[PDB]
Amino acid sequence: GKVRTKTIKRAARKIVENNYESLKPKDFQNNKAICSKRNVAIIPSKRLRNKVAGYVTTLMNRVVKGPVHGISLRLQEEERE
RNA sequence: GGGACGGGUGAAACAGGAUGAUCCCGCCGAGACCGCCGGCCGCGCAGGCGCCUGCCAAGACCGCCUCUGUCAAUCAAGGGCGAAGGCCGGGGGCUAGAAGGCGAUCAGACACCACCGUAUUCCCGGCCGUAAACGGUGCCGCCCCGCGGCCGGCGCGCGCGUCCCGCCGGCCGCCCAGGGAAACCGGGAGGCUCCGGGCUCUGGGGGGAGUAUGGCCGCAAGGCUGAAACUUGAAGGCAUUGACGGAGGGGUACCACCAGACGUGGAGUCUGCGGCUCAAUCUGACCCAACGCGCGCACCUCACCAGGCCCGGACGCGCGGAGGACCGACAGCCGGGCGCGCUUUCGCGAUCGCGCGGGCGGUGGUGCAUGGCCGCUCCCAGCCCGUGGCGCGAGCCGUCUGCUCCAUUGCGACAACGAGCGAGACCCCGGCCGCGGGCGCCGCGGGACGGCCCGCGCGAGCGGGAGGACGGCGGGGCGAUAGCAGGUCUGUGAUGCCCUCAGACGCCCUGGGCCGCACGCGCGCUACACUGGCGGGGCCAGCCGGCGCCCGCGAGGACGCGCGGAGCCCCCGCCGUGGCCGGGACCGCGGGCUGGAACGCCCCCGCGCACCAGGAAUGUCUUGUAGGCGCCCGCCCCCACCGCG
Ligand SMILES: CC[C@H]1CN2CCc3cc(OC)c(OC)cc3[C@@H]2C[C@@H]1C[C@H]1NCCc2cc(OC)c(OC)cc21
Ligand SMILES: [Mg+2]
Ligand SMILES: [Mg+2]
C-alpha cells in the first residue's frame, strides 16, 4: 500500500493542525508515540496507527519546509503586516 | 553517351529491353490546360467566371439644391437562357477513359487493385431541356439587443497615419429577448390561437405509381400532363438511455503476447460422455459457463427388468358382529422358497368387517409456478441518496476530455453542496524478537510505516542506495447494484398443481442390470532408456502417526501388550545400444482376505501386445515457483490411476 486512503489524510491533517508543537518531523517514533495518546488521538488498530503516523510525519516535514493551504499554523505574526 | 535491367503492387504477374531499353542531354511535332498568389475576396439573373496584348458593348454601387411626374408589385398563356452526360453534320487525335481485352484476389469475381484501349473529353452550326439545378428556406415592403471581421464609394477630425469617427450598399460570425416538437433561427424560421400588408405556386396516412390509357413536344433517348381497381396499420421527424462498430484516444491481464519452460493430440490403460445391444443396460448437465461431476454401484444404495409377501385403509357416519368380526397353524402335493395355493381340522377372540366421506405415503411430472443454495456476468470498480440547478419530457450535473494508482486510489477544478455502499481497513496462516508458562511448545505482546539518503514532480506520487527476519497488494477468507426463464421438485416434516393409491409408482423378499461394444473424444496414469534398468548397503520429512513374539517365500494367520515414520538421493558392482536385462497390456495352473454370498482385492511361477519422442491443432506457468519424488485423509465389507492436503 502506497496510495493512502482519504481517511488517513483527513485525520492526519486534523492531528497536525491540532498538535503541532509536539510533532517533530522526519522521525517515525515520536509521532507514533504522540498519536498513541488518547488525549491526542485514538487508533483502534496497530497498522492504521503506523500508517497515520507515517503520513503525519511526511505532511509535517512538507509543512516545516513550506507550509500548505488547509492547515492552520497561526503564522500571522510574521505575515500580519 | 553508357552498358543490364526496367515497369507496377500490400506482394506479385501480364505489356517493355544486346533490333542497346530504363537514365542524362539537345532539337522537332501536335493538342489540351492556365498552377504556388487563390481568400468566412470579388463578379454575374441563374447555370457559372482565372495566360499576354488589343478592340467592342454592358452593369451594380456611391455623390448631387440635374430631368419627368405614378410611369408601380406579382403573375396563368407566351418568349428567352440553362452544369454534365447524350444526338445530328463537319474538323481535330494529347492526356484521361464508359464498352471491350488481359494479369491478379476469391469458393466463385465477368467488381474493387495493375496494364492496353474505342466512343467521349476540344472547336464550329444545331437539337435535347434535365441535377442533392440546396441556403433542401418564393417575390415586394415596414420595425427590430449588442459585439465584431472583410469589400466598394463618400464625408469629418487631427499630431497626416493608406490613422479614427461616421454614412450607403454588399458578404459573413457570435448572440439577449422572442419563436419552435426539437435540432436550431435571431439581416428571422421574430413582431401570429392576443392567430387579417400585397401577389403567385405546391400538399392532405403509406403503397399500387410518376405506372396504365389519352394529349403535346423531340431524330432518338426521353420530357410536360397524369388515374383507377386493389392493398395496408402504421410509415415518418427531432431528441434520450443502452448494445454494437473490420471507428479514434487512453489504460490493463501468463485464464493475453514478447523470451523461455513443461506439456496434450501418436501407443497401452482408468474413468466419463455419445452411439449399438439387450428384459433392463435407470437418470441430470452439452463453448467459455456438460464429460473422476451429481463423495468408492456383488445384496441395500436404486429409480430400471423377471417374479413374489403385507395393509402397515387414521378419524367420523350407516349396517353386522362373541349363538363368534378378524386372525395363525403339524402333515401331503404344486411352488426358487413362505400355511403363497389346495387338500382334512385344530387354535385365537372384537385389537373390528362392508360402504360413504376423509387420509397418510410415493428417487413419479412441470427448475418455463416457486423458496433456499450455488454458477455466471465478476481473477470486474463500480452503485446510489437529501437539498439545489438545467430541460414540456424520457433524462442531465453531482459521478472529471487534467496528473497519478493494479484499483470511482488519490492531487487539483468545476451549478453544485453534503453523505453512504463496494475497494481498503478487517479475520486465519508463516518468517524475526520479548514475557509467561510448560506432560505435548502454546498463550499474550513488539516489529515495517514509502520510515532514512539522493533525484525529480506544487501536488499526491515515481527512479535509484542503504540498514534490516522481512520493502513496497506474502498466501488464503469475506464479498457491492442489477440481472439469467443458468443448475437443482432425485438433499430434507420446502413446497403449488397434475398422476398413482388395494392385481400399488406404497414398504419388503429372491434374482438380474447400471460394467454389456464394429466406433468418435474429455480429464488422467504407464512408457519409448545409459541424465538409464537390476542387486547389496547408508541415510534424512510434514499434514501427523500403534507395537512385540511365533508360523509362512510372499500375501497373510494364532497369540499378547501399549508403543512408534519415505521415496528421490549417495556409495559399491553387473548390463553395454541389440523392441535387449527398456515396456508390462493380455492370458493359464495355484495360494490367501472381506463378506451369508465373489463377478471384488492381494502374492507366486509361466507367456511377454503396441510403443524408436508422436500431423493438423492446443493448454498451463515468474521463487522455494514449474518440474521430478513419495506420504496421509474422503467416500469404503475389499479396492484409488480420483479429489482434498
Ligand atoms: C482490391 C484488391 C484486394 C486484393 N488483396 C487480397 C489479399 C490481400 C492480403 C493482404 O495482407 C498482406 C493485404 O494487405 C494490404 C491486401 C490484400 C488485397 C486486399 C484488396 C482488398 C481491398 N479492399 C478491402 C480492404 C483493403 C485494405 C488494403 O490495405 C491498404 C488494401 O491495400 C491496397 C486493399 C483492400
Ligand atoms: Mg457536352
Ligand atoms: Mg426545392
Ligand SMILES: [Mg+2]
Ligand atoms: Mg395566420
Ligand SMILES: [Mg+2]
Ligand atoms: Mg395537415
Ligand SMILES: [Mg+2]
Ligand atoms: Mg396519400
